[PDB]
Amino acid sequence: MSDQSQEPTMEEILASIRRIISEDDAPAEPAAEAAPPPPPEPEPEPVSFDDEVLELTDPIAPEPELPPLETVGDIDVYSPPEPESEPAYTPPPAAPVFDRDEVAEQLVGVSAASAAASAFGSLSSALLMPKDGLEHHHHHH
Question: Where is the composition biased (Acidic residues) (predicted)?
């Protein structure tokens, strides 16, 4: 329904009702079929596809802040994972008379969910001691 859809699509209708990022628990019944042969990959693989190692000789201290990693891929409006300085979803204070505003269709279906985070760095107070020094001498004779 971007310009002029021939048939009414359920996805597009939901988008029409809301144009903001939100959770969607609506039912789906997609279908697909494929089974192509795997590639020969004759070339060498000296470097992995997905890196999983890190090594920094010089330590860094970029303040005590570690934002969570989030991804996007749906009909819902695409926005950055950290919109700290991107106002739009939260309007400024105001007191205008409320107008008859109601929506449902199928997208929104009584939802909210909860989330929370809490992580602390591990610590220890022990180390290997191969040296014991069984022998001891100081005073003469």
Answer: 42-55
Question: Which DSSP state fits 12?
Answer: H
Q: What's the DSSP call for residue 58?
A: S
Separation of alpha carbons 99 and 40, rounded Å? 63
| Beta carbons within 8 Å of 42's beta carbon, 6+ residues apart | none
Terminal alpha carbon distance of the chain: 101
Give the pair of three-digit tokens for residue 125.
């107070």
CA distance 29 to 39: 30
Residue with tokens 């997905």: 50
Structure tokens at 90: 């939260």
Q: What is the DSSP letter of 1?
A: -
Experimental method: NMR
Chain-centroid distance, C-alpha 77: 15
d(CA 22, CA 111): 10
CA distance 128 to 58: 25
Helix, strand, coil distribution of the chain in percent, nearest 5: 5, 0, 95
